[PDB]
Ligand binder design. Structure first.
Ligand SMILES: Nc1ncnc2c1ncn2[C@@H]1O[C@H](COP(=O)(O)OP(=O)(O)O)[C@@H](O)[C@H]1O
Ligand SMILES: Nc1ncnc2c1ncn2[C@@H]1O[C@H](COP(=O)(O)OP(=O)(O)O)[C@@H](O)[C@H]1O
Ligand SMILES: Nc1ncnc2c1ncn2[C@@H]1O[C@H](COP(=O)(O)OP(=O)(O)O)[C@@H](O)[C@H]1O
Ligand SMILES: [Mg+2]
Ligand SMILES: [Mg+2]
Ligand SMILES: [Mg+2]
Lengths: 371, 371, 371
């Protein structure tokens, strides 16, 4: 029987069948509930919406995100999201298909414990497994040696690997991701006058961010140019016909990745965090990691991010090293593609957690049979 | 058992049976009482007249309107109007049928409280309901989205809806309707020497307004054209053969709707009222409201009103948006037609106030079980 | 020479000389123009009126506010109000006096750029300064730490400060203030048959809101009390001598501050705004901020507000922390009082923007020198 690969991200769900080369369904991880009153008898139905139907009717709803900062926080909505996925997106009964789930490293253990408990008790899957996202990202790239950098919607973590042996003491995780940039951009758009506060208009600001934002290769030069010239300005149209114009906000918004002090956080930028993660590895394997930086996740889709990372790491590492940034165009779905590859492998079939194993050992097993 | 439908206008009473295609009885809401010395013996009986028999005899009667600005001001007359309807026009037994009334938004609570009290205690109606006018108008159009401009004889309210969920913070209401236009017409006609002062001549002026008055597409152009040429002058005959002729008055009377200052008011015309109602709704749904701009009520039957409203709203709103004014030819009875459709619904049967429920809770129950 | 402190509020202008303990001039921030026929010859002069003399004649005027939500929208009238202030209320030529201003946080930049331009070029002040209102409100209390809650007529905004250092990522701003409450009062007074559709009647409703309104310590209990008895009702005499009577509208209106879902806003009440602004801070300073809460602004004069906010934050925050609401008796002017404090300090004299620096740099200097 064909297994199911389900990557519940903080921003998007990527679910489908093992063996494909792309997710079958991709819909935002939100659940909406009406806030106005219904008056037209026989209409105004379905007090909750999930995914794209909720997105379309967002004009009258408060949109709730179940997964925050990569730690699940609202289990009812998440069971609802899983049910919608299986029964309306994939349209396949979950109880007949082995399942593969993903989680970020350094995550609360109760997270995966209850994640296993739900999948076994409610959906009755024959077996299941949980795999660190960065391992899957490295599988998608066919490499056995790389320092994965995955930057999703709420989290951003590095995982240094060498010939298949991970280095769990060299793992860094950073709570700075796309939603933080969305909020900061919503905060700096009021600096021109365009005020967005709602849960709906946060989606407009996110769409603006996707549409226009880019990373400056030398921040001060772009700041000076924008302050002294108008070739960088750009205009975007809201759903009600208004047209907003944004100037240097385009490259100020993504810059939080490299200077988290824009939002007040203390941590060092992504570049310095990756270099530090490399420096924690044995002397004999810093060379290989310096040349196998594998990116992933949505937030790493900004133009100029790859060149900026290459520059900002080569500035730190010794001159004689060869920094190489690898960023395939498909990196928005790299974790899921790796998950598909991993679930397909014949030698992997001996590693699932089965229903009877769960019956004997309960959720606690998921830590022993999954790193 | 079939339920009556009674739409109590400020100027006309529309009554009928639920499910039918049009009202059964339509007559003005006036009560006349003779103002002259009776001389003949066994003649001129029946002290007070109502409706059509009041209009016919209006030579010797003092015509009074029980309602004013959509507020029932004389219950001792409105009870007579209801009795006339039930026991002379429809000729039904009120105890055998539910009754679905109507009332504009923002009316005083005591209005519907006392309305329900009268319906339940005087007529013994087994069940009843008081549905806002704009929702009925929107049923009558077979839609679930739109912004209704229902301009009756007392009130011109403006209710926006979206997918069955009304937006009560954006319901504008402007007290300027057909009666005020009749008053302004009656005043301006003194310019030419025709002095109408008695309450029957107010009916004559209402007839002139209905027959002739029309809304200019460009007010200043029509003013200049009428001033410089007599092409627009038209003649009307009083019931005594006196031939009056009114020129620019024909559009100076309706024009007040768009320039309320003509009668001393400040508030902006109906175009601005509708636009401001739109601009207070969520940003997502504005595009859909711009294209479902229903109208209703008697006063909107003026020729050239729809074109003028299209012109003005298109002028105000952003260009990229598409405005659409919708005006069905039977919009003089849209509220009643929607009431019929509503009363004919399947699920609507649970939402009647029942005589038992009113007896247990009291007139406050209309604020709970009705919009 | 003595410097002027000129706090241009959304609903009042507070002005005077720095150092004094109270404003020299306090008059409403409105401009009025006639709207009737000026029949008499040699009378009906002064085409427009400002402030108190504009209220005096409001019966024949249309009143307009230059500022809408702490944003200047009508420059040709704000300049007019400033001229009125300088040359009629303080009666001093400004070209010899430095000026201190105020603004809300997270506000459009063009606002202050243009304000600096007007002040320098039209009035010729030697120097001027613009300071966020919460900083000044914290000077008013002599506090170097705390979380200011400034709720003016236009806007509400929290600003946390710790031992002199601001946390501009944790600043929050909410556009819900006295005027929204006044309009909601105008709306809910219709239920009782009173109608206030005029701007002059908006001034009357503002006076009613000032007088009869308070905050409910437990909203449901107050609803039960009002429904179950007529204890709360109070009467107010209109200028015409008509007397109105209002029941639970006394606290339904100031309740919107804690439930913006009354007026269609989905946002969180001021208590949740404050709690979230605190939790955005670092862990070591939350304990200090919980016990250093400060209010300001006119809108916080509703009786019982401090106790209700005490209750709400104590409901949200951990039980071991101490919640304490500092509500100075003079909080209506806290901002102006803080300005009087600030402008006197010698150490501050080096922060003025002089005419010379403006000439060298242009209006953009106000973003680099001012907070
Ligand atoms: N082309 C893009 N440019 C910038 N940001 C993007 C782009 N596409 C997506 N994003 C951002 O990335 C986030 C989603 O990325 P994603 O990989 O799906 O995270 P996750 O799966 O964990 O939820 C979104 O919040 C979005 O703002
Ligand atoms: N053809 C018309 N042109 C202009 N006004 C009209 C026309 N027919 C009716 N009216 C006006 O519409 C008003 C009655 O319409 P109606 O919608 O039924 O008011 P109500 O809300 O009380 O029911 C009257 O004031 C009448 O003058
Ligand atoms: N004693 C009061 N009780 C209730 N509301 C008040 C009181 N004094 C003023 N207000 C309201 O607060 C607003 C004025 O407060 P204010 O602080 O001066 O605003 P601004 O920022 O413009 O200076 C007015 O809208 C008024 O309705
Ligand atoms: Mg991811
Ligand atoms: Mg009507
Ligand atoms: Mg103020």
């Amino acid at each position: 029987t064909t297994a199911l690969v389900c990557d519940n991200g903080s921003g998007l769900v990527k679910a489908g069948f093992a063996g494909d080369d792309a997710p079958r369904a991709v819909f935002p991880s939100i659940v909406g509930r009406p806030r106005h009153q219904g008056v037209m008898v026989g209409m105004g139905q379905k007090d909750s919406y999930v995914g794209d139907e909720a997105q379309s009717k967002r004009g009258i709803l408060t949109l709730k995100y179940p997964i925050e900062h990569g730690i699940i926080t609202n289990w009812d909505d998440m069971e609802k999201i899983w049910h919608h996925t299986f029964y309306n997106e994939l349209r396949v009964a979950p109880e007949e298909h082995p399942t593969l789930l993903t989680e970020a490293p350094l995550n609360p253990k109760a997270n995966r414990e209850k994640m296993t408990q739900i999948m076994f008790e409610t959906f009755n899957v024959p077996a299941m497994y949980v795999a660190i996202q960065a391992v899957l990202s490295l599988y998608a790239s066919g490499r056995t040696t790389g320092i994965v950098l995955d930057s999703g919607d709420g989290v951003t973590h590095n995982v240094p690997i060498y010939e298949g042996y991970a280095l769990p003491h060299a793992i860094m995780r950073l709570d700075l991701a796309g939603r933080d940039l969305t909020d900061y951009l919503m905060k700096i758009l009021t600096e021109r006058g365009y005020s967005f506060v709602t849960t709906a208009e946060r989606e407009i600001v996110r769409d603006i961010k996707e549409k226009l934002c880019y990373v400056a290769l030398d921040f001060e030069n772009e700041m000076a140019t924008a302050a002294s010239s108008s070739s960088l300005e750009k205009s975007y149209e809201l759903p009600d016909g208004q047209v907003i114009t944004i100037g240097n906000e385009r490259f100020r918004c993504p810059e939080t990745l490299f200077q988290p002090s824009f939002i007040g956080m203390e941590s060092a930028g992504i570049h310095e965090t990756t270099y530090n993660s490399i420096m924690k590895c044995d002397i004999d394997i810093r060379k290989d990691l310096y040349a196998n930086n594998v990116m992933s996740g949505g937030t790493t889709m900004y133009p100029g991010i790859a060149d900026r990372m290459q520059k900002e790491i080569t500035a730190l590492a010794p001159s004689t090293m060869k920094i190489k940034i690898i960023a395939p165009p498909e990196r928005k779905y790299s974790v899921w593609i790796g998950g598909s590859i991993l679930a397909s492998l014949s030698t992997f079939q001996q590693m699932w957690i089965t229903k009877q194993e769960y019956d004997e050992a309960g959720p606690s097993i998921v830590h022993r049979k999954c790193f």
